[PDB]
Amino acid sequence: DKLPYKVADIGLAAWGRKALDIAENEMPGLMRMRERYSASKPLKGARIAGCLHMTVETAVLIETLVTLGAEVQWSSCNIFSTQDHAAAAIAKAGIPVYAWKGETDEEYLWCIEQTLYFKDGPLNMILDDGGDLTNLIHTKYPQLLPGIRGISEETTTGVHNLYKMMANGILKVPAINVNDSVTKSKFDNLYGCRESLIDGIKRATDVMIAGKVAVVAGYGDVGKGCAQALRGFGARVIITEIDPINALQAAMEGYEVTTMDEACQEGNIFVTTTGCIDIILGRHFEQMKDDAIVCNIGHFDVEIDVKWLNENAVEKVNIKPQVDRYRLKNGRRIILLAEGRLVNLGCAMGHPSFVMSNSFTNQVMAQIELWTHPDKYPVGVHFLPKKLDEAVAEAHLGKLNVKLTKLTEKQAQYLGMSCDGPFKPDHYRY
Amino acid sequence: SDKLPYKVADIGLAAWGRKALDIAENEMPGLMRMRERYSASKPLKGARIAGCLHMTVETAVLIETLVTLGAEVQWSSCNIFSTQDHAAAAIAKAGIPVYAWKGETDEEYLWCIEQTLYFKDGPLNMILDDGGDLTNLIHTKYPQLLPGIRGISEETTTGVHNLYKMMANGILKVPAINVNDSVTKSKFDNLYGCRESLIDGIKRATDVMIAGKVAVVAGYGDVGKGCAQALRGFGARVIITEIDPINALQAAMEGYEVTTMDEACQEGNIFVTTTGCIDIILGRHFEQMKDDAIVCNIGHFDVEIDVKWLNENAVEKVNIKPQVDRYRLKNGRRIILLAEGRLVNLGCAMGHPSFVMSNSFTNQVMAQIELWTHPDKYPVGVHFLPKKLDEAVAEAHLGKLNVKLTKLTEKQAQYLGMSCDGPFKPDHYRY
Amino acid sequence: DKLPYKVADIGLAAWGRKALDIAENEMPGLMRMRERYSASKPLKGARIAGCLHMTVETAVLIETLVTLGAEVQWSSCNIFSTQDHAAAAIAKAGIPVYAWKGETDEEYLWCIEQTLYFKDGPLNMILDDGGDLTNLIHTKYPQLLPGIRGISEETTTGVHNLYKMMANGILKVPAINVNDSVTKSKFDNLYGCRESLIDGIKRATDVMIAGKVAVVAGYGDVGKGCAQALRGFGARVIITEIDPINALQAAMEGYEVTTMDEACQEGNIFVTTTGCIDIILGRHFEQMKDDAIVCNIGHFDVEIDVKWLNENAVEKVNIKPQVDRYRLKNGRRIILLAEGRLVNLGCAMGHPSFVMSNSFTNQVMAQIELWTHPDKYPVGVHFLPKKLDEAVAEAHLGKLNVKLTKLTEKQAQYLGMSCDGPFKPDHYRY
Amino acid sequence: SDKLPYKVADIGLAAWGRKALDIAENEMPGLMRMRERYSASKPLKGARIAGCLHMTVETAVLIETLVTLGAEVQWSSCNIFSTQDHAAAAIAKAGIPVYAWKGETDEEYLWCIEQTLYFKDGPLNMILDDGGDLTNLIHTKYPQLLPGIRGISEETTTGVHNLYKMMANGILKVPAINVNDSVTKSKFDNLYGCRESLIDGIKRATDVMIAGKVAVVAGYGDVGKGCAQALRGFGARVIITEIDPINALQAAMEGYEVTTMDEACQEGNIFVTTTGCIDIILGRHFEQMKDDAIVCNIGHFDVEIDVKWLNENAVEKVNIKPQVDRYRLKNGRRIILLAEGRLVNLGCAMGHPSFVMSNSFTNQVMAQIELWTHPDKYPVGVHFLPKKLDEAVAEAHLGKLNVKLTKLTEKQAQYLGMSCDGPFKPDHYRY
Ligand SMILES: NC(=O)c1ccc[n+]([C@@H]2O[C@H](COP(=O)([O-])OP(=O)(O)OC[C@H]3O[C@@H](n4cnc5c(N)ncnc54)[C@H](O)[C@@H]3O)[C@@H](O)[C@H]2O)c1
Ligand SMILES: NC(=O)c1ccc[n+]([C@@H]2O[C@H](COP(=O)([O-])OP(=O)(O)OC[C@H]3O[C@@H](n4cnc5c(N)ncnc54)[C@H](O)[C@@H]3O)[C@@H](O)[C@H]2O)c1
């Protein structure tokens, strides 16, 4: 028969629950969503199958969907991002969770497949982060497509895929771009990585940032956070970019912008925030400085040629889980973190719960949208109404004791807008 | 026939003005690159552009860029105190109809704007505005010229806000290009520009120290974002007010305290309004403020600080120097007003530096050229420049800063599904 | 009998030895000390008894002392700062070490006492951090005093104790104030906590810093470092000081400066860097927002009234090691870290090895000076010559690839100084 | 006798200077607290103080403070460009012998100082120096006045440096107090002061964009730290140069790149010498600078930049405006020099704001009182002020910033072993 779940140690449920209690008090968005849409169960009948890093933050989201009458089955969208105590807590809660830190490509695939069919029917809703789930159903379980009502993508890379599929006509089910919600990409990607990247490098290497020259590939919302994080600790940051705008942004901020070919000979730390392949190749590792720390924080491990290292390094010693130190022919060494997988989740705990509350509340609203108002979202990737976006940030103001100002009638008139309604044009960039 | 060829404060300043223009030029690669690339082409040939933008050394460079492109131009400042006399003299000497000077009166203001409407041979063809003052003047009092204008290009947030309002009500009769909302503008001019000019205007006017003082910044948009950081960098504790939950959540995540003006008015030692909205600082606030609290506005129109109240309420009002008034209230405390409520950077200083302005002005030039040569592509309404152009404005400036951009390899351009030259971000990207 | 050592599990030696390999490459100072005095063996005959946080950095220290021909016996200066794999590595190398994470007061004392007598006589030198060792001997083993050639403190609180002792003429052995060495106090205390403070709060709680209000008690080198870290992550930092000079500095940096009686009402995060007692009391706890994180970074755990919480809280749950969460009679909760002990070392790994190389390079120099030139240092607390101070700083320039400028003959004569000798007046504050 | 009672640019500027002083006094609590406490006691009665320090608004308040304490003063500036005419006017109108104006010549500089040696009642009693020129004039040309001078007061590092080199050679014949190395001075005036005044000078002189530029700051001392932090706060990439391994590591730990001037001279866009040393920027360096590179100095004396070389090698030299010259080398590239090498914060601006200057001048007034009231407490040499006085200086400025200082309790003070009022730090503390 099938397994009710599959975690590393159900025994961790105790500790994991203690952590969920703490994260809950830090995620007012998800809690404000609970108490409001609990007595109504707007997701009643929904059989949500999610694929997202099984962490304490995700655990609070999973229970929130449930609190809303939703039926759920989960898996982690990465073999190294799962938090066993958090996964156990959910497992103990009676939810079908299939994840654990340190899964093999095989087990990873298997884990997702275990969330495809519920006790009484296949999935009708999707909650993805990376696009791995949707890709599996569209390429291996097409039969389910018409059965699935909607989708909600979490990250940049996953959303990049959706548009691609829609533009090629491969996408056969509606989908809401959660990553590009203002209260997401401008907070999660930016502030979330501003605090999580350094944590991943720290727990893994304990290296001192100050005095070190760090190279950040790409200056998007993620790279902006990483660069700021490193600079704030006293590190000289260099940036690489392909977009003249982003590149000019980094320059206006006092960052040096050059190519990886030149920068590889200066960096003491390397972070890839690009969403594309071949960012750091052997040509680069060969010129690096002894004991240069290298990691990737992008969604997919396709930026650092970890393969070249294994097939070219003279020695390969593992310091501890997710931390390896290669020795090249030149005699110098290289430090690889999480085997190239997103370092903040692989070597640490990912973004703190507060910022995650922002993303996850967008996620919940999205599920409620593709499930309650299918007519508003036909086959194609859509954005969540700016009215809801503003609402998400609104829910997180109180905790920070922030006092929002209210537009008077005269003022609302003068500006031509509702003191309650949206405050910015859809094209606004924040 | 007695229409003056120009009208500045002192033609003698042209010499010193030209000097500043040569230096500024070597800071504005965008514009200069637009000249060498379109000088012989003369895309703006036949066009008669009538602009209404702050007559500064940076604007002068834009005026000559348009002229180098075979465009007939007549200019006027869009704010009574923003004009730089030596800059107007230089242009006035170049033989261009200039009507602007520091210290204009409401009367003279409107006058100047009207002295640019008719060129020696025909009405205006295009409208280069900043604030909407020109666009509105025509639409209401000179509607007969509407069908003779191939398009408008708005410079700032307030002006562009006005256009949309007109289009919504269908009151907008001539096409328009939203320049302010071009990434290489709003996210640069509004942000990095104010970050260096605000303190500049306050410093030149009061010389007050920022380190240690508490500063209140009304609004946290692109201008507020830059103002807050400028203040913060100098050691001042910044407090922000906001109506937008998102914007407010942004300032909090940046270590800023966010509250209402009603409460911040009792703490502030320096106040800066970055809102395009009225009624920000009122008597209620002035009465609570601290002794010698500095008050100023950096928004387009002087509709944020109720200066009228200060005039009709202070026990006395002294003038330390031009654009700097020190009122004394009944409570015995004093208040320092800058530029009589007008945008402080330009009113008390010299506005954004030349390098950054090159960005916005290059977008302005691409707008004129676009709205002029390709009118059969811009219906009646407000539009944005193609991201290809927006991106072009950025790259044109990388050189100066010696920025070495990376080129996508063939494999990468495929993996990402985009041209190694074509647009790099979707239309919804927020940078 | 006398155990040859005592650690948590010597099976961690392999991992500890690896952690040292990496560390040795991050501490140029200590390594330049070995290659320069290896054959010289200046510390020959010296029986050094050390009492300092048994960590990866401290391990590289001990091994340096040994390379210089000294005999060493070690113990930690705190019950929670010991890093087991680092303590194990040292134990396996034959170096007597009595330290493990999670000691008790009884075992703490016991550990120090195992380092008093060597396999061939009582201790010669005292490498202490906090005064526990120098105080233990001056009060229980005065007969060993005349046999001790010198003492070298490490931290502020400890050096303070030394002065207080000399003043009352209780100090019966020449000591060198290492902490107040420029390359120490202005780097270790400052940049060190700037990276380690947040590190300790995160591994323990994973809380988001951005948005929170943080109250840092005190504004000294440590206070400065912590404060900068917190606001670097987007937290609003409120300071509390008793020294008007330090207070003006904070205000000139943009920090609000009030009393704890005031701040205890706004703080979401509390960090005490004061060197004294009674900073956060029950009166304060009763007013902290729900789930306020309170920790201490001062040497001794005398800044936070942890007893009060235990005898007044209506609930107390242990999330995990060094992480307790209480619930007051008012219903609001409080998260205490390391039971009030220095959090950076109790909840993390202390400062990164690079900045510690600075501190420890001075420590070794202090041991050599005191042991090699006993006469040159009579009974009392002394500083290290500025020529030596600059030497330390200059030894780490290479690693960061810094190009120091050499004064020309003309320039040197103009400035009235040697192009090699001291570059600053003795009262220079940097 | 023809000795003029004063000599200023335009005493008709006094009206405006007085206004400036009004605002200034309200920003200098320390200086006003001094008079507010000794106005009656008149502790400086009988003192004939001759001060040689940048005649500015801040300095004006300093002078009026001493006068309020019963001292008699004749003043002169210690730099040919740091004088602010309207300020020098106010003091003049107030009936105080002041010889200084903006634009002086070496000859007039020497003259201006000598006019402050003899008072109506005879030779000077006290010295208030900044740079040491006055103390050097007396010691070398008027050694017969030495036995008549009680004490000296050095404001800046350079001067203080001279006092030691003098005492060391035993050529210092009068007790002097090192005011610069007082915590409330060097760790506030040099650091935070320049952090706000360096840019100000650069801006008013050039209006250049700081964001995106590469800046090179020679020296990482109290001034270097301040300047560097300011520049990068605006988005400039700051490269540092140093000869002291400690300072060098400090800058490196702050994320600054530290190389040699020989290298940085090839990639800098803005140069700022904050060293008190010679030969920092030479012709070999100029010849490698990027086009239109702005070069300036903020060190006391103009000896860091080889301005002489520029005049004797450039093929073109155009003066844009006072204190702003643009050269063109044989390599075809241009170079913007400010204030001809003199301290740019005062040469092209208004120096440090009034607030922080209060910290410096408070120690100044304090030193005078000490040196004049307790002469026996200071043998021949150079000393610092008691730490308890330093704390008092800072504490006197907490009020305006609204800082709530904390008081040690009985138990606390006992545990720490220090008076809940007495000095809080050991003599060697570095803050
Ligand atoms: N680990 C996390 O917590 C987290 C959080 C959010 C997003 N992400 C991931 O981060 C990535 C992208 O960042 P964003 O999400 O900030 O998106 P952008 O902001 O979409 O991201 C990438 C940036 O890199 C640049 N770039 C692309 N190819 C490059 C090359 N070869 N060299 C140099 N620069 C290049 C682009 O011009 C762009 O500015 C995705 O993979 C996304 O899924 C991770
Ligand atoms: N002086 C200059 O150099 C310069 C340069 C660019 C723009 N501007 C002007 O600055 C203004 C707006 O800034 P942006 O940055 O252009 O636009 P947003 O970024 O459009 O601007 C205003 C911000 O203020 C907030 N706000 C609105 N009403 C408020 C109220 N009553 N209280 C508190 N906050 C309120 C909004 O939510 C928004 O975040 C316009 O007037 C524009 O023309 C001046």
Ligand SMILES: NC(=O)c1ccc[n+]([C@@H]2O[C@H](COP(=O)([O-])OP(=O)(O)OC[C@H]3O[C@@H](n4cnc5c(N)ncnc54)[C@H](O)[C@@H]3O)[C@@H](O)[C@H]2O)c1
């Ligand atoms: N955990 C670590 O890594 C580390 C590293 C270095 C020092 N320390 C410890 O930090 C402490 C002191 O810091 P420093 O930075 O070493 O020394 P200072 O800089 O000597 O330290 C304390 C500061 O707190 C202030 N202060 C004292 N009592 C106060 C009170 N009741 N309220 C508010 N402010 C008060 C003082 O004015 C002073 O500025 C010592 O206990 C020292 O051993 C810890």
Ligand SMILES: NC(=O)c1ccc[n+]([C@@H]2O[C@H](COP(=O)([O-])OP(=O)(O)OC[C@H]3O[C@@H](n4cnc5c(N)ncnc54)[C@H](O)[C@@H]3O)[C@@H](O)[C@H]2O)c1
């Ligand atoms: N204009 C102002 O407002 C103001 C205010 C305070 C001090 N100053 C002046 O600033 C100067 C010194 O600064 P401080 O900050 O006073 O003193 P430090 O802090 O004494 O000053 C200089 C620093 O430069 C370094 N240095 C010396 N020679 C060098 C060389 N050839 N190359 C590279 N680096 C070198 C030293 O190692 C030192 O750290 C003096 O001239 C002083 O009078 C000006």
Ligand SMILES: Nc1ncnc2c1ncn2[C@@H]1C(F)=C(CO)C(=O)[C@H]1O
């Ligand atoms: N602690 C965390 N818990 C859950 N999800 C997280 C966390 N930190 C970051 N993420 C997400 C993650 F990985 C990516 C990019 O794929 C996102 O865009 C985020 O939503």
Ligand SMILES: Nc1ncnc2c1ncn2[C@@H]1C(F)=C(CO)C(=O)[C@H]1O
């Ligand atoms: N120095 C300057 N020169 C010319 N135009 C400037 C300058 N500084 C700011 N601005 C413009 C200005 F005023 C507004 C808002 O109305 C803008 O949005 C800018 O383009």
Ligand SMILES: Nc1ncnc2c1ncn2[C@@H]1C(F)=C(CO)C(=O)[C@H]1O
């Ligand atoms: N990782 C570390 N390893 C060893 N010692 C450290 C570390 N981080 C900080 N310290 C010391 C510590 F604890 C105190 C205060 O007592 C100091 O002053 C430091 O030398």
Ligand SMILES: Nc1ncnc2c1ncn2[C@@H]1C(F)=C(CO)C(=O)[C@H]1O
């Ligand atoms: N606004 C100002 N007013 C008076 N003196 C000032 C000012 N700004 C800086 N200084 C002094 C100055 F010039 C030097 C270096 O010689 C110092 O060290 C300062 O005290």
